[PDB]
Nucleic acid binder design. Structure first.
Ligand SMILES: [K+]
Ligand SMILES: [K+]
Ligand SMILES: [K+]
Ligand SMILES: [K+]
Ligand SMILES: [K+]
Ligand SMILES: [K+]
Ligand SMILES: [K+]
Ligand SMILES: [K+]
Ligand SMILES: [K+]
Ligand SMILES: [K+]
Ligand SMILES: [K+]
Ligand SMILES: [K+]
Ligand SMILES: [K+]
Ligand SMILES: [K+]
Ligand SMILES: [Mg+2]
Ligand SMILES: [Mg+2]
Ligand SMILES: [Mg+2]
Ligand SMILES: [Mg+2]
Ligand SMILES: [Mg+2]
Ligand SMILES: [Mg+2]
Ligand SMILES: [Mg+2]
Ligand SMILES: [Mg+2]
Ligand SMILES: [Mg+2]
Ligand SMILES: [Mg+2]
Ligand SMILES: [Mg+2]
Ligand SMILES: [Mg+2]
Ligand SMILES: [Mg+2]
Ligand SMILES: [Mg+2]
Ligand SMILES: [Mg+2]
Ligand SMILES: [Mg+2]
Ligand SMILES: [Mg+2]
Ligand SMILES: [Mg+2]
Ligand SMILES: [Mg+2]
Ligand SMILES: [Mg+2]
Ligand SMILES: [Mg+2]
Ligand SMILES: [Mg+2]
Ligand SMILES: [Mg+2]
Ligand SMILES: [Mg+2]
Ligand SMILES: [Mg+2]
Ligand SMILES: [Mg+2]
Ligand SMILES: [Mg+2]
Ligand SMILES: [Mg+2]
Ligand SMILES: [Mg+2]
Ligand SMILES: [Mg+2]
Ligand SMILES: [Mg+2]
Ligand SMILES: [Mg+2]
Ligand SMILES: [Mg+2]
Ligand SMILES: [Mg+2]
Ligand SMILES: [Mg+2]
Ligand SMILES: [Mg+2]
Ligand SMILES: [Mg+2]
Ligand SMILES: [Mg+2]
Lengths: 48, 142, 16, 103, 56, 50, 117, 110
RNA sequence: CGGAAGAUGUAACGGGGCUAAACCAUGCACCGAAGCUGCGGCAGCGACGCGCGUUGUUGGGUAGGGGAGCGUUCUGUAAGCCUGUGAAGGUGUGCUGUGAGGCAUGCUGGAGGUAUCAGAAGUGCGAAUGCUGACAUAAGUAACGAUAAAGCGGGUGAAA
RNA sequence: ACCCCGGCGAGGGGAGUGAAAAAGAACCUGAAACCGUGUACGUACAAGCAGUGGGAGCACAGCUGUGUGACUGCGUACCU
């Protein structure tokens, strides 16, 4: 029990998605938005 | 242990003499092309010229089948606009018989530097005499 | 018929 | 004198004293390995051709070294399709020294 | 009219393969003054072919 | 960022990339795209978990 | 927590440029060009590991054919003969023997001829 | 052993000076000085002063004999370019580079 | 077989050439792919025995979904640990891992660096007619700004 | 400081200072593009994304390593 021997529970801390950081990530380029249209745009999307 | 490769500086090339008289052009040419390339040797190596020197005598008496003697046309372009020229087999044999065998063989050899080198080993004569006694060519029946 | 207008000039802009 | 034998789904022409790189054998270093499937033995003019194997034909070898070959790089790339993948590879081998060839 | 592609340093050097200067093949020596001079030209001290031809 | 809202050069005709603001985050001296603000990092800890 | 990219970016570029040594002009000097060259070099190398196995077999066969024909039989009949004789020597070895031990090669040819006879 | 002289920030593009430098590379210094005296190029003046300085350095600082000296190395490097403006038609300005050169001459008796 | 004419050049077998090296029929050989098999290795999913063994099977991928990592700056661990026995940075070399990478060490550098496990992100660039600086190319090319015009002697000067 | 080349220059070479002056004021470190000098090998009968697989020869360091790469199979950049 030291400040450098404490660990979170397994599964408690998932890393967030980081879009647009290259091919290997699987979220490069379009960042999961597909190609074109309103929903690909910044601020895009239709109201509820 | 890597596969053997022939070496330009150690490869042994022999001299042969062939008589073209009455031979069918294309069937003579394939055998020449084979031997110029060295495809008949176990040391055959695609990037090395392992072939033999070949003298061809009596190029003027080479044979062709069908109506080719009158109907086979050789085309070339001078590079000047409209400069397509032509000559029948007959005309070629009269004007420059050696070209007929040389053309047939050149077309059956690899294109590129090595193929040009291979072709330099073919010596074609219209008649029955050559001046290569010093190279002591062995008779080759094709 | 013509598929293009006859060439014209652009207005001057501060170049650099 | 040389012999031909199969090992690691490949064939080898060896003489006594040769070191030969084979696919990894499960044999410790220093230990001797016998190859009993000899396809051919040629002692000068005498030539024994197996059909497929030479009867009584054995090649004795000593395991000299295990190791990994030089790294190969695998590159996969599909132009215009946002796809690229790289991988490395080093193949295991066993070096053996041919000690004896028996007819 | 202008290039569609940047010419290489190689091509630049090839073009300049004819730009080298020639050294003056040989200078002459005045027989009297002993000065070096361009052939068929007077020396710096005003000599030509042995004779003093100009002042300064 | 300090500076005016003047369009640096006209939209079309100059042969340059289109520009709207000298303060664009693409530009040297421009704004930071997602500029930080002062933040409160404190977390709730349930009394019973403490 | 501002992160400057210089040190890491330099290392990545240098890694690519080291792999582009020996290439012509911008291909060994300029990262944009070198990166494309190194990727393409990798694509060819992958393809060529497959092609190498094809090129060598093609070479062995041509050599076996030459040696077989010196011993009065074509490649196709020779291979057929060896199979009927239950000889399991591969083309790499046959081609090797054709060059280095012509007497042993002739022995194989005789074996093959007997199996067809 | 070998003596150096340099003219740093010489007012001439390296390309022009290198024409002259090439004439004397490898020559005996006496031959070099003659060659430079009858080369009708501004660069020949620049290079000759550096070569003369190198000879004087070799004699004074390194107790060498002028008779034995050869131009063993000579090279011209690019110095800083001074940037200037050249007005062109229609309100456009062009950059002018005033290119400079660093001239190095190495003489030695070997 | 004729019927059968087109524009840069043969140019309507890919070419050479072929009277079979064409066509039909029958047959047997061989070549031939990243398919299949052989040998070695990796990973996923599932059985089966106890995290390991044995075994089956699977592993081309855009949009896109899921999983697992590398490295960067900063906080704690750290008043610890490394550091003229030479820090960071720069530049080579060797080794090493499936990869992002890592380790060692020569040279440069001359004072900083930071294991481990956690924590936070201005966390990774080749493209955006991106932005700033530097430097190329064309090129020693065009040009040297009114076609009123110069020549010579002397002077000064390192040079006119 | 002083000496030397130079126009009583610029610039440089010595000397000296300093732990260091490739710390010399265009000054800590001093990357890359870009430009040179030197050395090894290749290159003036040869056709194309310039590599890759094969591969001689030459040079060099301890049969291997390193550089080069004649000849040859395959092979039309990247992003969008
Ligand atoms: K999505
Ligand atoms: K401002
Ligand atoms: K910027
Ligand atoms: K500012
Ligand atoms: K994921
Ligand atoms: K290092
Ligand atoms: K260091
Ligand atoms: K830490
Ligand atoms: K850009
Ligand atoms: K230029
Ligand atoms: K000029
Ligand atoms: K320093
Ligand atoms: K090639
Ligand atoms: K694009
Ligand atoms: Mg996807
Ligand atoms: Mg898009
Ligand atoms: Mg659409
Ligand atoms: Mg959509
Ligand atoms: Mg918006
Ligand atoms: Mg071809
Ligand atoms: Mg274009
Ligand atoms: Mg010129
Ligand atoms: Mg307004
Ligand atoms: Mg700001
Ligand atoms: Mg409370
Ligand atoms: Mg910081
Ligand atoms: Mg004006
Ligand atoms: Mg026509
Ligand atoms: Mg295959
Ligand atoms: Mg398969
Ligand atoms: Mg397996
Ligand atoms: Mg598959
Ligand atoms: Mg997949
Ligand atoms: Mg030091
Ligand atoms: Mg960022
Ligand atoms: Mg960049
Ligand atoms: Mg991109
Ligand atoms: Mg542009
Ligand atoms: Mg420019
Ligand atoms: Mg021009
Ligand atoms: Mg002109
Ligand atoms: Mg002019
Ligand atoms: Mg004027
Ligand atoms: Mg006057
Ligand atoms: Mg001074
Ligand atoms: Mg010290
Ligand atoms: Mg300091
Ligand atoms: Mg500095
Ligand atoms: Mg540099
Ligand atoms: Mg040549
Ligand atoms: Mg060309
Ligand atoms: Mg090709």
């Amino acid at each position: 029990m030291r400040l450098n021997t404490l660990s979170p529970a397994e599964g408690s801390k998932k890393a967030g998605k980081r879009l647009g950081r290259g091919i290997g990530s699987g979220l490069g380029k379009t960042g999961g938005r597909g190609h074109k249209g309103q929903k690909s745009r910044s601020g895009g999307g239709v109201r509820r | 242990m890597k596969t053997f490769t022939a070496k330009p500086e150690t490869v042994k090339r022999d001299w042969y003499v062939v008589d073209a008289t009455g031979k069918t052009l294309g069937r003579l040419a394939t055998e020449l092309a084979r031997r110029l390339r060295g495809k008949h040797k176990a040391e055959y190596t695609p990037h090395v010229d392992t072939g033999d020197y070949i003298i061809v005598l009596n190029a003027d008496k080479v044979a062709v089948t069908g109506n080719k003697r009158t109907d086979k046309v050789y085309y070339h372009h001078t590079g000047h606009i409209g400069g397509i020229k032509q000559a029948t087999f007959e005309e070629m044999i009269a004007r420059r018989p050696e070209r007929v065998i040389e053309i047939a063989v050149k077309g059956m050899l690899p294109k590129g530097p090595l193929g040009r080198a291979m072709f330099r080993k073919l010596k074609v004569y219209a008649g029955n005499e050559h001046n290569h006694a010093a190279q002591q060519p062995q008779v080759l029946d094709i | 018929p013509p598929h293009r207008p006859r060439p014209r000039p652009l207005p001057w802009f501060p170049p650099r | 004198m040389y012999a031909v034998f199969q090992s690691g789904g490949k064939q080898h022409r060896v003489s006594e004293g040769q070191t030969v790189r084979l696919e990894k054998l499960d044999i410790a270093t220093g230990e001797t390995v016998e190859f009993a499937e000899v396809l051919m033995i040629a002692n000068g003019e005498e030539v024994k051709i197996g059909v497929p194997f030479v009867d009584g034909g054995v090649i004795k070898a000593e395991v000299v070294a295990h190791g990994r070959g030089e790294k190969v790089k695998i590159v996969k790339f599909r132009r215009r399709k946002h796809y690229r993948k790289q991988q490395g590879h080093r193949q295991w081998f066993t070096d053996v020294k041919i000690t004896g060839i028996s007819a | 009219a202008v290039q569609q592609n940047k010419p290489t340093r190689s091509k630049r050097g090839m073009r300049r393969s004819h730009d080298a200067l020639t050294a003056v093949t040989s200078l002459s020596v005045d027989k009297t003054s002993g000065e070096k001079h361009l052939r068929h030209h007077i020396t710096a001290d005003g000599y030509y072919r042995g004779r003093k031809v100009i002042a300064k | 960022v300090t500076g005016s809202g003047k369009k640096p050069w006209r939209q079309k005709g100059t042969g340059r990339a289109r520009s709207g603001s000298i303060k664009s985050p693409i530009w040297r001296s421009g704004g930071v795209t997602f500029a930080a603000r002062p933040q409160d990092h404190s977390q709730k800890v349930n009394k019973k978990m403490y | 927590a501002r992160v400057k990219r210089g040190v890491i970016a330099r290392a990545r570029h240098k890694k690519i440029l080291k792999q582009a040594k020996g290439y012509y002009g911008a291909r060994s000097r300029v990262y944009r060009v070198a990166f494309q060259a190194v990727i393409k070099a990798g694509q060819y190398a992958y393809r060529d590991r497959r092609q190498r196995k094809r090129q060598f077999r093609q070479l062995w066969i041509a050599r076996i054919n030459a040696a077989a024909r010196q011993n009065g039989i074509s490649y196709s009949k020779f291979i057929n003969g060896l199979k009927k004789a239950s000889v399991e020597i591969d083309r790499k070895i046959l081609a090797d023997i054709a060059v280095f031990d012509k007497v042993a090669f002739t022995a194989l040819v005789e074996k093959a001829k007997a199996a067809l006879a | 052993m070998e003596t150096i002289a340099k003219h740093r920030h010489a007012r001439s593009s390296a390309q022009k000076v290198r024409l002259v430098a090439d004439l004397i590379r490898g020559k005996k210094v006496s031959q070099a000085l003659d060659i430079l005296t009858y080369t009708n190029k501004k660069a020949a003046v620049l290079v000759k002063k550096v070569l003369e300085s190198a000879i004087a350095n070799a004699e004074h600082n390194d107790g060498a004999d002028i008779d034995d000296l050869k131009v063993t190395k000579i090279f011209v490097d690019e110095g800083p370019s001074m940037k200037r403006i050249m007005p062109r038609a229609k309100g456009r300005a062009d950059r002018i580079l005033k290119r400079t050169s660093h001239i190095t001459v190495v003489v030695s008796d070997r």
